[PDB]
Amino acid sequence: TDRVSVGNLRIARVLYDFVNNEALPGTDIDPDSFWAGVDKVVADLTPQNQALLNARDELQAQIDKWHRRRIDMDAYRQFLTEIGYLLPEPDDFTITTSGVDAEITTTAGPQLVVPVLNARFALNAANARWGSLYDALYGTDVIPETDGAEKGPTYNKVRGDKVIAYARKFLDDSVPLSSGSFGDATGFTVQDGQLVVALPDKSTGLANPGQFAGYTGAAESPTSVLLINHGLHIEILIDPESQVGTTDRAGVKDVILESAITTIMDFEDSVAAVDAADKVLGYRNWLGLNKGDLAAARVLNRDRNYTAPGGGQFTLPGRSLMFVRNVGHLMTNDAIVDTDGSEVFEGIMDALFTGLIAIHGLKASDVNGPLINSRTGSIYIVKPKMHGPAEVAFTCELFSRVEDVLGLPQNTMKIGIMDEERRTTVNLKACIKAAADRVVFINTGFLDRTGDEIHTSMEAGPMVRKGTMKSQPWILAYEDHNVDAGLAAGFSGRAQVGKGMWTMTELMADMVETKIAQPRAGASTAWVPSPTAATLHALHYHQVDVAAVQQGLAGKRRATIEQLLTIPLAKELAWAPDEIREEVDNNCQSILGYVVRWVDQGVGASKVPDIHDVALMEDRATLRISSQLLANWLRHGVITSADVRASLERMAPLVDRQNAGDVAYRPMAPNFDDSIAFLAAQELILSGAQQPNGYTEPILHRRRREFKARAAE
Ligand SMILES: O=C(O)C1=C/C(=C2\C=Nc3ccccc32)NN1
Ligand SMILES: [Mg+2]
């Protein structure tokens, strides 16, 4: 209820007040003009937005019928071409985007993704540009807790020594000495622009003196030594009076790594935001981060100060350069409605509002606030779930029109193309071309892209199990195809090529062991769930020369269209009944475990124990893959209707028990039919086949609004 009328728009009062009183001031944009701009952009671009969404449904309908009238890959591919799903590949080109920050064009390193509605997590992320290696090693299972090195209420010095040793070895691998090991260092000095390291006998310098990047304190006895490797900084904090430094052979207190080079503040799959009040909380946090005054009861960090090897001062950034992830093209939100009572497209709103807010981040002031995000004056929006190059061109048009409403130079709002839909994958080169002057980023993932995969080929037959999907031909070609297209479009030295998220937040040893594969595959960046994970993952960019990898990959075409189009159908008699049961339970607990927190508590990302009590931090896309898989098995009679109900009922109390220790929690068992969460989870499965491209948000947003409305009394 209660709205402000502006032309054809009926704007929720809370939103209206927030923009005028909080967002607009300092931007020198006339409030009346802004709202007219909103009304106009919305009226003009809404039909297009709708036209694209209808085109998806049409395409999917044809693909459905085709499968029902049957596999001949040659005919399939020709069909996709005929219906305008597979478009012709454009001639080679190089992107032209300008005014892009160094964090994106040149530096390879970790990238954090955080739900914007959580100010605490958002604050930590922005400050995770720099992280303590010691804390990360000590706090996680990277250092085993075995030989007397278990963690306790108090500091364990045996475990500390292992941390130190691990770090000492890292230094050896990253910034090697001409002779000897950092392990035996006793002191650090700066003699004539050159870092001397004191060993017991002799005293050496860096193998490459070029890696010596600066220091703090007196050259004769620095308080820290700054190093650089593969563009990433390493700070050795020296302090013999500290407890840790006291026992260190060279007085070293800590090793600090440049960690999360960039961060994505997320308005999409990691948050639950189903109405106007929610969007405002989200927008307000975004405002604070760009104002640079967001804080919790604690602040955002300022740049760091150093001394060049041969005297003189310099400075380095102290915050993670921020992107924002807008919602995609599909959903509407009641934050604004029309005179007929039709909700306005949420993506259109996000562009306008997140873009307005981001103006503050281009300026250091007192009306705009103290801390600056982008130094070149770009706004970095990541756009999810686009299908095909027309939808990309549409996003760029939206951005262009928003830039006019905001009075920003054209091409200010950069785009990060997420490759997570089949129709974007197979037309990827064309998608990048459609954004050739705005694009700063492409990336791959597992959850959404597989959900689309399952849904697109829904009628073709039963898919393989979810675990199996990570090793299927289509996804391996997809991963490699992404890297190839970016590099072919000239991304190396111009834009990020990213890869997916490590979801197992407690298995850091495993992450350190395996996630190295991503930069080895030429990814200039990849997702981590926490600041701690960003610090650990930063080790990989030290061990791997991403720029060299990309250069060596140049011109290769490692994935074919046939490979991309290889549908992940299961072979005959693939599974025993126990395996089927295990897969169903797996997916049902996955849905119930994530849905219960989303619907009941408005939580979009958290450590959710899986069926075997492994902690996984996933976003909403987990629902899409899980629900589509079950819907597929349901459709082709792998499982009956009884089967699915029995599983949800078995898994509900287990999820109930898994949330013990949360006072806010309300059990779903034993009264399932009275549980809005249980029903939401059941619906996502039973109606899964009929949701557009398998998306979960229509069901979810509806059930969360229903829960919130039941809670209104
Ligand atoms: O595999 C994918 O497609 C995918 C995983 C994922 C996340 C996993 N944990 C998260 C926490 C916060 C925001 C996003 C995520 N996003 N996309
Ligand atoms: Mg996604």
UniProtKB/Swiss-Prot annotation:
Enzyme category, top tier: transferase
Cysteines paired by S-S bonds: none
Modified residues (Cysteine sulfenic acid (-SOH)): 605
GO cellular component, one term: extracellular region
Binding, glyoxylate: 325, 420, 445-448
Active site: 325 (proton acceptor), 619 (proton donor)
UniProt pathway annotation: Carbohydrate metabolism; glyoxylate cycle; (S)-malate from isocitrate: step 2/2
Annotated keywords: Cytoplasm, Glyoxylate bypass, Magnesium, Metal-binding, Oxidation, Transferase, Tricarboxylic acid cycle
Pfam families referenced in this protein's UniProt entry, alphabetically: MS_C, MS_N, MS_TIM-barrel, MSG_insertion
Subunit structure: Homodimer.
Function comment: Involved in the glycolate utilization. Catalyzes the condensation and subsequent hydrolysis of acetyl-coenzyme A (acetyl-CoA) and glyoxylate to form malate and CoA.
Designated name of the protein: Malate synthase G
